[PDB]
Ligand binder design. Sequence first.
Ligand SMILES: *[C@@H]1O[C@H](CO)[C@@H](O[C@@H]2O[C@H](CO)[C@@H](O[C@@H]3O[C@H](CO)[C@@H](O)[C@H](O)[C@@H]3O)[C@H](O)[C@H]2NC(C)=O)[C@H](O)[C@H]1NC(C)=O
Ligand SMILES: *[C@@H]1O[C@H](CO)[C@@H](O[C@@H]2O[C@H](CO)[C@@H](O[C@@H]3O[C@H](CO)[C@@H](O)[C@H](O)[C@@H]3O)[C@H](O)[C@H]2NC(C)=O)[C@H](O)[C@H]1NC(C)=O
Ligand SMILES: [Cl-]
Ligand SMILES: [K+]
Length: 536
Amino acid sequence: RMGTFIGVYLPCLQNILGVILFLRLTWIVGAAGVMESFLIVAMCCTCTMLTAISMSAIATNGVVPAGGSYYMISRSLGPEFGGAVGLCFYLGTTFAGAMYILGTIEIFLTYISPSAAIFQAETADGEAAALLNNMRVYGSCALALMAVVVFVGVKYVNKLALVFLACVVLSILAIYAGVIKTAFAPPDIPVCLLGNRTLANRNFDTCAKMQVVSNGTVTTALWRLFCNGSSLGATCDEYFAQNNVTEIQGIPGVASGVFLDNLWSTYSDKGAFVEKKGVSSVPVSEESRPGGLPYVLTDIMTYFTMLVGIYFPSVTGIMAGSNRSGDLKDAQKSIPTGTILAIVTTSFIYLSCIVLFGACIEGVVLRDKFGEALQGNLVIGMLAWPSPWVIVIGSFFSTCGAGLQSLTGAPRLLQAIARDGIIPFLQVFGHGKANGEPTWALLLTALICETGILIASLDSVAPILSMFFLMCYMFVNLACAVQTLLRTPNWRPRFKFYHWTLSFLGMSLCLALMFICSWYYALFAMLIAGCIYKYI
Ligand SMILES: *[C@@H]1O[C@H](CO)[C@@H](O[C@@H]2O[C@H](CO)[C@@H](O[C@@H]3O[C@H](CO)[C@@H](O)[C@H](O)[C@@H]3O)[C@H](O)[C@H]2NC(C)=O)[C@H](O)[C@H]1NC(C)=O
Ligand SMILES: *[C@@H]1O[C@H](CO)[C@@H](O[C@@H]2O[C@H](CO)[C@@H](O[C@@H]3O[C@H](CO)[C@@H](O)[C@H](O)[C@@H]3O)[C@H](O)[C@H]2NC(C)=O)[C@H](O)[C@H]1NC(C)=O
Ligand SMILES: [Cl-]
Ligand SMILES: [K+]
């Protein structure tokens, strides 16, 4: 028997906090402004808070059965809602596992061991075409190893969830320690630029121009990289000879300097240079030549309503506190307080991190997303106090642990759906090992997660996860609303602060979020969502 803290509040903090806060929150604050990102996080936290209130009403209605969240949802709501919500949350869990192991592999390939990942080509576009294949092969390897270890060592991972959560909370503590200690002695982070273009200092040092005085008349290492020859006047690029070089102080301390700079959105295109406003730059207007030059070039084009689909997995995962409802003591009291306090905690964390990222990191550093301008390091790791080597290993361990947790929880939930004869076409996934864990569902989960991982892009596998979780939350909200609306013979919720209009407002809210994220998926998603509903 467990209580309130370890029973509910820690698993929610464990599975909510994940890869996005470490790998894409800074890029999101950079591409949009502080205001747009504020609006994004307000929406994505309001939908989850309203869904949590409705789910707490479910949790306090009646005698909650023991087991997972599916038993609660099925017993309280109708059976057909149970199957639809279970299918949606199952697909969400497996695609979230795909995204989490993708984040693990991205960390390992990009930040820790760059002298790795053999599957590469030597061409300007060859790297952009071979990164996907390299991430695909490492993804297949990691998924296979993950399924193998979760098929054997199930008694190992549950004792390791404590270590995973300790690692991620230590990472958050380090980020706050850095953002507080930057007020007295900010670090000396150099970022070099020609004006409205900035350079990726992976290779060179001392970004000053032609002659650093060793004897006074030797070319800079940067000079050779732009110019054809290591000599003066060796037919260098015209943009190099028109514009000057300078060095800006990346990550200034949080004092009145950059908050007004990073305020409004930019919404750059794909392939354009990352630009700093204010500095003077003359144009050329006859040549671009972006291939082999050390300019940092952007990722996929950034417009609003795409950042919603990138960001939303950062706030999801609230069905975890309702996962261990069998082993609680007075679960109807533990769940509605623990879940809502968890969402309040994570929303406070995200709002604080946004308002601090807007006010400490330079706006040209924010749009890096790969650390190409900070000597190939991590930007949020360079923000931390002791060393960036704690944040990279922290995110590595936490993301690998979250992936293990998803690959543990999704097959058990699929097995619990299949045991009930709600789906007669999929009864075969009811066989399990004599110990009691599922075996045949694990194959299907690993296969669906591989189908997810073959897309091999964290920025285009996140919207699928977002749409699935939005559909699940919308179904739960609509179910509670219409249940208390039609005054069903068995719907007696005992939660104090629960209306019929509050769940309706949540339903409409993340309906608008789904419609604003991607509408082309939304059409056929709502089409099949109604179609699976009538079959039962
Ligand atoms: C390279 O960086 C320097 C900043 O150190 C800038 O070039 C600077 O440009 C200004 C404006 O043309 C120059 O000032 C002028 O200076 C002369 C010097 O006698 C003065 O008589 C004029 O009244 C005027 O104030 C300044 O000398 C020059 N500094 C240099 C070359 O070190 C500029 O930001 C960059 N140059 C570019 C983009 O061409
Ligand atoms: C960084 O420096 C460049 C180099 O001067 C500047 O580019 C300026 O960017 C604006 C907005 O993209 C351009 O404006 C628009 O240009 C089109 C081109 O025909 C014109 O038809 C529109 O009416 C509008 O004025 C501007 O031409 C361009 N100036 C240049 C290239 O000399 C700007 O300071 C920075 N680049 C940005 C913000 O993209
Ligand atoms: Cl959830
Ligand atoms: K999450």
